[PDB]
Design a binder for this molecule. Sequence first.
Ligand code: CLA
Ligand code: CLA
Ligand code: BCR
Lengths: 136, 42, 212, 219, 65
Amino acid sequence: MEHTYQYSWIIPFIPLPVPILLGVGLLLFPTATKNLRRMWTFLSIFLLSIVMIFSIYLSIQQIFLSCIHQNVWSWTINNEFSFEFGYFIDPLTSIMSILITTVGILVLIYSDNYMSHDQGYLRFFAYMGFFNTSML
Amino acid sequence: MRDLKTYLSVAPVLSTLWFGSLAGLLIEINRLFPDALTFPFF
Amino acid sequence: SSVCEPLPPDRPLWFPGSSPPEWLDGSLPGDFGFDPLGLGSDPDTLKWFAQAELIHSRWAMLAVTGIIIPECLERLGFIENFSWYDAGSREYFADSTTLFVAQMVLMGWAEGRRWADLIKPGSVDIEPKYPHKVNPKPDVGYPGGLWFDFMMWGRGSPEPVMVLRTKEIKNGRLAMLAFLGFCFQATYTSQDPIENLMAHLADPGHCNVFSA
Amino acid sequence: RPLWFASSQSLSYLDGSLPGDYGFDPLGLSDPEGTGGFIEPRWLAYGEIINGRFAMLGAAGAIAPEILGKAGLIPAETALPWFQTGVIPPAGTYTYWADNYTLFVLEMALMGFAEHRRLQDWYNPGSMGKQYFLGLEKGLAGSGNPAYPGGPFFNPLGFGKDEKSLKELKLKEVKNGRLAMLAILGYFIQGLVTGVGPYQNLLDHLADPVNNNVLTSLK
Amino acid sequence: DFIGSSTNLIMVTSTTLMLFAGRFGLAPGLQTGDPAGFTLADTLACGTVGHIIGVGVVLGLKNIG
Ligand code: CLA
Ligand code: CLA
Ligand SMILES: CC1=C(/C=C/C(C)=C/C=C/C(C)=C/C=C/C=C(C)/C=C/C=C(C)/C=C/C2=C(C)CCCC2(C)C)C(C)(C)CCC1
């Protein structure tokens, strides 16, 4: 509780860099990143596995301890906005996080072979990882 | 290693290995169960 | 596509300019001719030693992971009082002796199935059969399988099979040496590996093995 | 043709085929018949050249910190003799950015990469240009002689394109190297017999040459 | 040492007389520029023997007289 909710901001942002690298890879150097065809697959699967393990750990702390963490930061401070982008850990957060991560990892293991005979491969996994980013 | 396993298969090398293992076994047994003169375990 | 093509004779060796031995042609992954003593002369025994290296390296890789990653989590504030060389002495349930015999039972099943693979390759076959579907016959140590190749990376999908097996073996030799460093420098410093890394990176000159 | 203490057997293998063939082999080390190990007439030539080169570096790097230090040009802290630098901790020790044993591991590793390559070039000269050593093996291949590789890395300039100039330079090399080896022997024996630096010995002998060598075994 | 003393004189004369006895005298490859033999080995030999005689005589003189 003391040091594990302060790093609860990463679980959206951990899937993100492989769609960032694909969105600057396929858009700039398509032969290069498509030559690295199956590696971004396993990189998305590994980053979603990190988010899976961290969501399972938060779920274990929710079923052990009854608390809610609302680790909010500041986003815009000019006038009446004072906007926040923080991360609200209720048991619903744990249910939804494992519900995203487990299904997403299994669909990515599935989609390594579903798209294995597709010319459109890496932009699908960019959409997948950015969708998992957005939904988490 | 070829022909080293044949040397270690030879009677004195094999006898010293077997009797070193066996003597260590007896030695550690006598450490564990020292000063034995009966078999009371039935 | 899936043939396990070997390395060429003009491959990089452990010692450049040296003659590789005749029993290390390159059929095995990570073949750089390392044999100052020549323990792999008999090829029927070099197969067993290749399997030995493979399993040794896989266990060392999982082990170095289970040492350094959880220590990173301890530094992040997840696990309390972590120390791998005192993580067997600390308390669990089952006394650490019931755990040992349950471990020996379960790992005896697993490693016995692997042994039966080693003695006779097709005995313990897995990846169950399917109609008009020919599961490819695997090699020892690389069973493929639905359980160990579910991403189908072993038959040579992302990269060739030889370079992937060489990746496994080289990354794992490095992990074997990392675990030897763990077993040695956690007893000649009585401290943490990551702590030792940050301590040497503080002053690389005087914070070396010769200080202790 | 200049012969310095030549013998009847020394004029059977030291004809002209080496830099510095003054025929000086009274003991009979480099006799080609019945050879093996490190007493070989080729390995002994290589050893002369290499100990001479390392002795030239030693001679013009051991009195250099005292050639300067008694004339300015450096701090007096980094102006120790050849033996008060940590290489004789009984006699002296300087504190560098690492302890002396880390620096020994440095020497061992870096010179291992530098000299095991040299050794495998001694065994098969064609090597050291066939394995990927970060691409800089392009210059480490050309050997010819083992002791005189002459590539882009060791011989960037020509300095002996023709064989006359190269022979004269090889002669100058081995002669300056023998002089430097005798100089290193003088360094060791002088530091052992006086306990001061070699430049201190030179300045004490030059200025008022009294008790030049009469101080036998006295510090 | 202490050139000019007795210990120097009766050692120098012993060394030089042994070198002479080997050169032109009854005492006895390595081609030297010397007219008649007396190589470096013979030179070192006569020097060694003359030093033997010199040590013997200086210490027989230091024992008595
Ligand atoms: C032949 C004459 C003789 C006899 C009968 C004995 C008898 C004995 N000596 Mg003496 N001794 C002798 C000669 C003899 N010795 C000689 C010649 C010397 C000089 C070299 C000695 C020097 C000596 C010393 C110095 C000592 C003895 C001791 C002993 C006792 C052995 C206790 C022990 O460790 O066994 C324990 C049992 C074993 C080691 C056998 C274990 C075998 C393995 C584990 C297999 C068994 C299990 C197997 C799988 C079957 C299970 C069944 C099933 C489940 C499969 C025993 C009374 C020791 C003692 O206690 O003093 C009384 C002692 O200290 N002796
Ligand atoms: C479990 C250990 C183990 C085993 C069985 C093997 C087995 C093999 N290796 Mg691998 N290897 C290992 C660890 C191991 N390796 C590690 C840790 C490294 C990195 C240091 C390497 C690096 C390496 C290279 C670069 C190459 C091999 C090769 C080979 C093959 C031929 C050598 C042989 O038969 O040795 C059998 C070895 C043993 C039976 C183990 C040795 C046990 C004895 C008792 C000595 C142990 C003490 C040791 C020296 C302590 C270390 C001290 C420390 C200061 C370093 C064979 C398949 C060659 C090959 O064809 O690759 C497939 C090859 O080119 N290996
Ligand atoms: C003629 C001439 C010449 C010359 C001359 C001369 C004069 C010379 C000299 C020389 C010399 C002058 C030499 C010397 C040498 C020496 C030596 C060689 C020594 C040795 C020593 C030893 C060996 C010791 C021993 C011992 C001891 C230590 C002590 C104890 C006892 C004894 C004694 C045993 C010339 C050529 C120039 C030219 C021409 C002219």
